[PDB]
Amino acid sequence: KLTVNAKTAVVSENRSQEGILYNDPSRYGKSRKNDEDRDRYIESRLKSSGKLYRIFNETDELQWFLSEIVKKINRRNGLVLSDMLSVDDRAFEKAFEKYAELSYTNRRNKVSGSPAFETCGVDAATAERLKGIISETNFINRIKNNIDNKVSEDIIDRIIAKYLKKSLCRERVKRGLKKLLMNAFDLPYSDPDIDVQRDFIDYVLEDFYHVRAKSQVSRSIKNMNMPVQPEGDGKFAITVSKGGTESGNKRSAEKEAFKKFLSDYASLDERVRDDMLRRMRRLVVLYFYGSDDSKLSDVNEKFDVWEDHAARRVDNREFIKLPLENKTDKDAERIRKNTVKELYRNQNIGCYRQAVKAVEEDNNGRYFDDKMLNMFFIHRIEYGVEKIYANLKQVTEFKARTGYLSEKIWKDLINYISIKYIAMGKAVYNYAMDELNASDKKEIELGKISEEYLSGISSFDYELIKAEEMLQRETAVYVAFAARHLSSQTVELDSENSDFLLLKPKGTMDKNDKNKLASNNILNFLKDKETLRDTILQYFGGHSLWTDFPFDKYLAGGKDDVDFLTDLKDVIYSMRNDSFHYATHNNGKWNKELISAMFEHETERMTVVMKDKFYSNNLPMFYKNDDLKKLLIDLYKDNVERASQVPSFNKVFVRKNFPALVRDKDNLGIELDLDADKGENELKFYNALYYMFKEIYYNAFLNDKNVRERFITKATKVADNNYIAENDFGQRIKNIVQVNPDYTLAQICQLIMTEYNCMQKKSAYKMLLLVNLRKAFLEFIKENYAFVLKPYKHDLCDKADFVPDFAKYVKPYAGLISRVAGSSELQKWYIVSRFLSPAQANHMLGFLHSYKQYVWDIYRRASETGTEINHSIAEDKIAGVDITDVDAVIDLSVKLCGTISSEISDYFKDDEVYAEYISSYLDFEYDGGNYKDSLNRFCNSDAVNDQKVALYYDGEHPKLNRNIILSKLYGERRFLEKITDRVSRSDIVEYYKLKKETSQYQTKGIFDSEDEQKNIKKFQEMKNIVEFRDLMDYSEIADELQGQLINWIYLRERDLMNFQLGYHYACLNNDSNKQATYVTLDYQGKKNRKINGAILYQICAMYINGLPLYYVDKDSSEWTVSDGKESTGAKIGEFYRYAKSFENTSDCYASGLEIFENISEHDNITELRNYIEHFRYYSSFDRSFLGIYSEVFDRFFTYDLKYRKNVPTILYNILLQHFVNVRFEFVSGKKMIGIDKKIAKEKECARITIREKNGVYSEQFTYKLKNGTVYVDARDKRYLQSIIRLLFYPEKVNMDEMIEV
RNA sequence: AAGAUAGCCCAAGAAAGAGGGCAAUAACCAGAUAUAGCCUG
């Protein structure tokens, strides 16, 4: 990358913008580059490549022969341009550079022929010498100097396709080089249209001296800008470049014409938009089908553009003729693909020149009146064709069809209109809707640009927006999951009442018969009202922990546990569509005293929980309680707010290598001296030490002052004295600490990891961070916790005897308790996070960390560049609440969500119900009597030899399995049954046999032989099965697949609002006919208010929880205002009743949405959105995850190609994160158009599936041994089978054929 | 309907041009919640 030293940004001063280069990290006054320094920086980066410049870049006999030819050409005395042009003590370097500039200038000024050196400051005699140096004869001699071999035309072809430098990979340059090489090797060859001197040699000189980048790159950076900027009259519009050159001025004029198109197209009169789309459609038909196409003959024919679109798509006409296939020879296929790309380019050039001519000659009403608008679209069309072939992955016949290309370009032009209206709405929503903020103003004005942004938008401004929108979208996913988990055990929904958050309180009656309950009254759906409180308290750790809590104090009067459930439902709902940007918000409808009291009650157990984890992790088995007490107070006296982008403990201390690293004398030298319980006690110790070090790592190590100082000195050792990398890594650390000496260790890690950072996850600075953190932690242990070096096995004390005086030394939650009591917003974060799975709560916490670090980094870079920035996005607060408080709240949920009660009665009604529930995942040979006795006999039966089954029983009762209860609270039972097989006796037999085989080398960590490593992996796989750990893995994968779908839902909903905002903002600001209430609402009710820019206010009100909407009520037929808390679906209906008077349209809500989507599928989009967010998949299983992702790819992101075309890759990445590699196959399925209430028709749909044979394979783990290295499948066939079932259910496939081994 | 594995902005450009930028835009990278599960780099 050219600008690898620096970063770019866009700054705006007084409605004028400038792209800048700046060094990072740096200080104000030393970061932003001035004009001259920007110019010399680019120039310096270009000249730093001249001496390594080579025409060619960089096992089989032929492939290895081609590499030897390239190397010999690139060697000394070969084609080394720096040696050739610096001859005679560099006396001719300036003349050669001047020649290269004149050669380029002659091209863009259309002067034929190579420049004469006499015009490069050189006499006629020297000119003859220089011309000879860069002649074909001399190039041939340099090429031949190190080669004494025979080649062919095909060999030269393969060398050019595989090794020619990218900057030289243009058709005429490649043909010039081929002609040169054939002449060099005395092979007969003819290419009469090509001149070796002008087409290859002269161009190589232009490329060697970088004459294009030298004269253009710096100016192109300075003229960069944002998508939207204010105009003179304080209106947002798409940004138009300033131009400055002949081609730049024409380009800006075309862009101004399209800006007028966006203004004129925003018309409620659909006939106006219909006519404009028809003219754009005729440009597409002209481009691909010529001026004599039948749809261009009659200028006044109002043909259906969409029916023409469908007709062309199935046309068999060929855009180019593809060459025949090759006799796979991958070198031959690359040559063929390059030939195919040139065929596309030549035909695309022909189509362009023909369309430009026909637009100028035979318009007369066919196209747009503005010629610059026709040219803008023709340039878009040519660019769209190039987008298709420039990154062609494989030559296919369908992609060579004219109808495929014309219709891809048609949707491409509509895409461009869609993203520009969305871009306009983005600027309007964030910067021109200030008076949405709750106020006492009786008259407000929407759509006026806030004062801080009238001078324009900077790139830092949009980085802040991204940070906020990312966290908002991530939080919307967990709101949905919290609602799902709360509903899963309390209510049973139906298809008509499938959104738990929209159920109504127990007193809600039917509107048309007040004698009956409302259909959505929560009473109609309760699974068991008499156990409702205990069912809810399962998610608060079990009701046994609440026997002292005065529920009746808060549920007094006629309130009961149904109001308890309703209050929790109301908390979660108040966070849905709760905008971080506009406060409507801090006074919840629910019982704030009850929720606050439950929070305080939960903080009171936190010290007990954290010290219990020391006990449960067997730390008091190897260390003195007094030494552990000291550590507990150190770690948990204060709530620790973790920073993002710090390497995780598990990456610094890999668990596999942990026993060996602990015993190493150079690290810690810990040896535990220990009968039958020997190997089991060593395993307990290393597991205990691993948990203790992890807690130390996060709660004491990372923030220690002495640790940071010694980290810096050690990391910069090699710098002040792999060896290549540690020197550069050390110098980077030195630069960081010089810029700011107060940077924390986390901030140094963040800055390093920044420059360390392709859309696809890759299958098979960071290490030096890991190594230096590892070394610093070991010394921190030796300096501050020396007692850990001397473990001693002794009997475990009683759980209640382990540091019972812990609470009296620490009070970490003292201040937070009162702040939650007075903050409805804090209570929202509490309840939403509290109802997540432990893994989800952890992810939510990580997203908060990434948000805080992002905002801090934006303001850091804005400050060093001297860029004034509005602080609407705070570094320390979110939605008016301290991020530190939100962090502590989510962290409490993370810990308590994973703390399962020890009482079976907290989750089940007796041991028999629990045993039967276990039978859904374990086949303990149920005879038919009672499940409890069947399980007890199973565990008491012989497994292998002298070993009983055991595992699942704890004395007189079945053993409480942590993974079983977590799947009950947070997982989906029917889903897990349908994708997995129950644990069997043979599983347990194989478990115990592998436990015995590995019992002698289990804690060796890193192993000697290949058979030892494979048997260890096999035992770990069997342990995961018998402990139901694979069950949790599948549940998390499903949660990640479902979470991404919900993420996409709120991505689309944001952009639908932005499209509507930008479109109606453009309509408000054009001269088209607009009715009174579209512009101004004058509401005269008791809550009177005058709304200027009413359409914009009402659009945003549809999407913001708490923003009231003005409408004419159904039953009263009079104007009213809502409280703003009604559902999105209710607000859409209300918006229709606000616009129902509109006389220039039948549907204001849908105006312009033909650009955003296919209107005929609008209700199908709503159905898919509801299907996902209401978790209908887990109740019906009518579609597969692959089928849901397929429909999203097919029609959920019609509004923006960059989201649609990444949908399959995102799915591929999620699976690869769990070490599953899948190979996609894109085929056909079915989808409905419309919803029956009875006009729905069926149509073809995109179907993403997996290749039938060898479509799924596991990633390989690289397992280092003592001497060698072995590769083992990360996931066995049984794991891959459940992944396939997860993706395909209810569809069944041949998994023996699909899985590759 | 689709056959994905980007998209946009600046520059260049008709004997085409094809040089730069993007935490701005999604993805990517990173994140450890619980007891042998995310190795390697």
Short mmCIF file of N, CA and C in Angstrom, two decimals, chain A residues 1186 1247 1249-1252 1256 1280-1281 1283-1299:
data_model
loop_
_atom_site.label_atom_id
_atom_site.label_comp_id
_atom_site.label_asym_id
_atom_site.label_seq_id
_atom_site.Cartn_x
_atom_site.Cartn_y
_atom_site.Cartn_z
N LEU A 1186 -30.18 -22.68 6.20
CA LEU A 1186 -29.73 -22.44 4.84
C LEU A 1186 -30.83 -21.81 4.00
N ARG A 1247 -31.22 -20.28 -4.02
CA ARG A 1247 -31.04 -21.27 -2.96
C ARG A 1247 -29.56 -21.50 -2.76
N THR A 1249 -26.96 -23.79 -1.12
CA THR A 1249 -26.82 -25.13 -0.56
C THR A 1249 -25.34 -25.46 -0.50
N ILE A 1250 -25.04 -26.67 -0.03
CA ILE A 1250 -23.66 -27.14 0.11
C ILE A 1250 -23.43 -28.25 -0.90
N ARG A 1251 -22.23 -28.27 -1.50
CA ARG A 1251 -21.89 -29.25 -2.52
C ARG A 1251 -22.20 -30.66 -2.05
N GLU A 1252 -22.86 -31.43 -2.92
CA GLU A 1252 -23.40 -32.73 -2.52
C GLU A 1252 -22.30 -33.70 -2.10
N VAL A 1256 -18.35 -30.44 2.84
CA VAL A 1256 -18.06 -30.06 4.22
C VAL A 1256 -16.80 -30.80 4.67
N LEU A 1280 -19.37 -32.86 12.49
CA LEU A 1280 -19.76 -32.31 11.20
C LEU A 1280 -21.17 -32.73 10.81
N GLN A 1281 -21.58 -33.94 11.20
CA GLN A 1281 -22.94 -34.39 10.92
C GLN A 1281 -23.97 -33.49 11.60
N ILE A 1283 -23.53 -30.37 12.48
CA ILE A 1283 -23.48 -29.07 11.80
C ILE A 1283 -24.31 -29.12 10.52
N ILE A 1284 -24.19 -30.21 9.75
CA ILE A 1284 -24.98 -30.34 8.53
C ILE A 1284 -26.47 -30.39 8.87
N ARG A 1285 -26.84 -31.17 9.89
CA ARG A 1285 -28.24 -31.22 10.30
C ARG A 1285 -28.72 -29.85 10.77
N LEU A 1286 -27.87 -29.12 11.49
CA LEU A 1286 -28.21 -27.77 11.92
C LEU A 1286 -28.53 -26.88 10.72
N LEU A 1287 -27.74 -26.99 9.65
CA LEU A 1287 -27.92 -26.12 8.49
C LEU A 1287 -29.09 -26.55 7.62
N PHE A 1288 -29.39 -27.85 7.55
CA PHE A 1288 -30.33 -28.37 6.56
C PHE A 1288 -31.70 -28.73 7.11
N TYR A 1289 -31.81 -29.06 8.40
CA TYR A 1289 -33.09 -29.50 8.94
C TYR A 1289 -34.18 -28.47 8.64
N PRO A 1290 -35.37 -28.90 8.17
CA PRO A 1290 -35.85 -30.28 8.09
C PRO A 1290 -35.41 -31.09 6.87
N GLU A 1291 -34.66 -30.49 5.95
CA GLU A 1291 -34.17 -31.25 4.80
C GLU A 1291 -33.10 -32.24 5.24
N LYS A 1292 -33.17 -33.45 4.70
CA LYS A 1292 -32.18 -34.49 4.96
C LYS A 1292 -31.28 -34.64 3.74
N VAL A 1293 -30.00 -34.89 3.99
CA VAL A 1293 -29.01 -35.03 2.93
C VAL A 1293 -28.17 -36.27 3.21
N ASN A 1294 -27.40 -36.68 2.20
CA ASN A 1294 -26.46 -37.79 2.33
C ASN A 1294 -25.18 -37.25 2.94
N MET A 1295 -25.06 -37.37 4.27
CA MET A 1295 -23.91 -36.80 4.95
C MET A 1295 -22.65 -37.62 4.73
N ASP A 1296 -22.78 -38.92 4.46
CA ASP A 1296 -21.60 -39.71 4.10
C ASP A 1296 -20.96 -39.17 2.83
N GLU A 1297 -21.78 -38.72 1.88
CA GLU A 1297 -21.26 -38.18 0.63
C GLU A 1297 -20.75 -36.76 0.79
N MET A 1298 -21.43 -35.96 1.61
CA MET A 1298 -21.10 -34.54 1.72
C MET A 1298 -19.84 -34.30 2.55
N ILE A 1299 -19.60 -35.12 3.57
CA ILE A 1299 -18.48 -34.90 4.47
C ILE A 1299 -17.21 -35.46 3.85
#
